[PDB]
Amino acid sequence: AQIGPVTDLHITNANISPDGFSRPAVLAGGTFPGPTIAGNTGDNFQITVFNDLTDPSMLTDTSIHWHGLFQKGTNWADGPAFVTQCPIITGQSFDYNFNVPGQAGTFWYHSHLSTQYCDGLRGPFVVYDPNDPNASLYDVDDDTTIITLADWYHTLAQQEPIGAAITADATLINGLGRSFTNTTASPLSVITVQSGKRYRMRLVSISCDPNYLFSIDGHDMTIIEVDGVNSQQLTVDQIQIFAAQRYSFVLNANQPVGNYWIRAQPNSGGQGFDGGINSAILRYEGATVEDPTTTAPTTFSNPLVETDLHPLADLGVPGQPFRGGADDPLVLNLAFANGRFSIDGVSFVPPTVPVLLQILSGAQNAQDLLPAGSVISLPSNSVIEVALPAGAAGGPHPFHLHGHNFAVVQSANNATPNYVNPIWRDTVSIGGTGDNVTIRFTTNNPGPWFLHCHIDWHLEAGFAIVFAEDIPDTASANPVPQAWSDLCPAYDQAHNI
Numbered sequence: 001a002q003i004g005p006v007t008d009l010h011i012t013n014a015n016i017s018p019d020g021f022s023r024p025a026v027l028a029g030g031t032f033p034g035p036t037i038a039g040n041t042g043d044n045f046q047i048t049v050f051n052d053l054t055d056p057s058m059l060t061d062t063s064i065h066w067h068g069l070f071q072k073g074t075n076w077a078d079g080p081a082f083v084t085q086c087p088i089i090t091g092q093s094f095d096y097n098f099n100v101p102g103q104a105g106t107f108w109y110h111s112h113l114s115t116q117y118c119d120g121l122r123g124p125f126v127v128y129d130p131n132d133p134n135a136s137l138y139d140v141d142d143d144t145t146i147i148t149l150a151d152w153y154h155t156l157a158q159q160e161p162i163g164a165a166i167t168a169d170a171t172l173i174n175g176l177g178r179s180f181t182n183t184t185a186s187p188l189s190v191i192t193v194q195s196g197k198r199y200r201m202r203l204v205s206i207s208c209d210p211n212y213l214f215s216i217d218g219h220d221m222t223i224i225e226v227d228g229v230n231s232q233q234l235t236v237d238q239i240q241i242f243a244a245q246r247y248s249f250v251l252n253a254n255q256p257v258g259n260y261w262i263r264a265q266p267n268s269g270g271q272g273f274d275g276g277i278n279s280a281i282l283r284y285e286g287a288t289v290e291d292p293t294t295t296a297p298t299t300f301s302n303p304l305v306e307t308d309l310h311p312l313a314d315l316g317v318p319g320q321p322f323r324g325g326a327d328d329p330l331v332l333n334l335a336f337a338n339g340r341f342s343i344d345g346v347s348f349v350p351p352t353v354p355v356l357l358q359i360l361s362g363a364q365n366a367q368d369l370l371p372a373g374s375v376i377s378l379p380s381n382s383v384i385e386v387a388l389p390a391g392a393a394g395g396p397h398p399f400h401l402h403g404h405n406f407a408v409v410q411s412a413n414n415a416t417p418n419y420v421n422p423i424w425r426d427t428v429s430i431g432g433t434g435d436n437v438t439i440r441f442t443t444n445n446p447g448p449w450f451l452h453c454h455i456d457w458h459l460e461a462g463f464a465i466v467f468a469e470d471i472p473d474t475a476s477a478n479p480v481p482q483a484w485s486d487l488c489p490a491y492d493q494a495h496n497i
């Protein structure tokens, strides 16, 4: 069952074996992935998170972010550790009490402390629309139509050795899949459909790192939502999905009753499908209980290309139709060297005092805010443009902005900008060497909003900045509850800070 919009959520340690290999984990709701948190557009969510963690090898503190939810007036509930809060300590709980006006779509939640989400604290978050403009395109949309794609590691996140390459050991689809090495025939996930019906499949990348080439043998996929934003229908036969992105697609159960492979090929780790790695099963009701015998094509006919997506609504693009045609046009220098990432020459290292608390205590320019050089002010009620030219090692980097979605004025692998009708989304691949992926948004949400690469290993290695949006109005806009004010004193006492 789905939980929410008002629910407790306990964070625990447990052993799991999603690929047949047992290791300890950090879990929400006792499962990997965590349970789906759900409600309707405009609802009040009150997620009371109970930190019951005891194993220090995966950190006993925690903090949870609600990815893609704008948190307008509730910046204190956003979750990134040392940006909007101090972590919750073990044996304590905290009510993330917020509303979701004006949003409906497919989201997710995850730890936002260190690399802890990799250790298991990740799950879907769905905001349904009772009046969805896409409702007539499908028959079924429920917990059985959510498809999560996850990387899974045998080595614990905190225990990944400094200086060795990090790759995953299994792809997990709906929490199950097989290991790339020492492969055993552990159970695969089954997604069940009925011949003749149409399904809103909600595809969620909960990845810590790889992008996936997602397909379903014999089928095609009609995209209707991108990172929470309704799209015009776009039919594809493969989706390259980067860390933290979401798509809804209509699956028409229009093939013969049978079994079909579901494929999710990561860009690192095991290549191919030998032994059933990188695989799940689409099973029609009435099919034999057996593995598919289908194959992929050598070449996909209609892969997703980001510039083909367009909003369902008339969203346009703010600003003027040329580079730099914004009130605050920025170009970030994104670099990597010697194990650390940097933005405009500064590698992100989380501060002792969360950025929001520094602002509430009266620090009112961004040059005043710690970490020095990592916090950039944005003016209120202004069009912002951010060019994110690629080239830094470890790409392609999926950049994500908290508090906002954005127009993707320029996409990967295509030098032509689109000032007319590009898709809006919240996580975008910045592409390859020489690219100039560029985003635009308007500043109508006071507070400090993290901008970072969503490859968690890269965030940990410093690939982030904070946009302190409308510093002057942050305090008035974001009244804080006592429990939030209590977090940093409790954390600092527990840690002798």
Ligand SMILES: *[C@@H]1O[C@H](CO)[C@@H](O[C@@H]2O[C@H](CO)[C@@H](O)[C@H](O)[C@H]2NC(C)=O)[C@H](O)[C@H]1NC(C)=O
Binding pocket: 323, 324, 331, 387, 389, 434, 435, 436, 438
């Ligand atoms: C990406 O686009 C930005 C603009 O959105 C380019 O920024 C210009 O950079 C040159 C130096 O390279 C400056 O003289 C300009 O002031 C910048 N802004 C403009 C023209 O609006 C940037 O060069 C582009 N980067 C790449 C790699 O293509």
Ligand SMILES: *[C@@H]1O[C@H](CO)[C@@H](O[C@@H]2O[C@H](CO)[C@@H](O)[C@H](O)[C@H]2NC(C)=O)[C@H](O)[C@H]1NC(C)=O
Binding pocket: 305, 307, 308, 414, 415, 416, 417, 418, 419
């Ligand atoms: C590269 O990106 C551009 C801009 O998004 C794409 O150009 C659009 O193409 C559509 C479809 O033919 C036209 O309706 C638009 O008028 C174009 N807009 C602009 C600003 O040129 C282009 O299709 C993309 N290239 C590829 C190969 O997909």
Ligand SMILES: [Cu+2]
Binding pocket: 065, 067, 068, 110, 244, 454
């Ligand atoms: Cu996220």
Ligand SMILES: [Cu+2]
Binding pocket: 065, 066, 067, 068, 400, 401, 402, 403
């Ligand atoms: Cu986010």
Ligand SMILES: [Cu+2]
Binding pocket: 394, 395, 396, 397, 398, 453, 454, 455, 458, 459, 463
């Ligand atoms: Cu990255």
Ligand SMILES: [Cu+2]
Binding pocket: 065, 080, 112, 400, 402, 450, 452
């Ligand atoms: Cu983040």
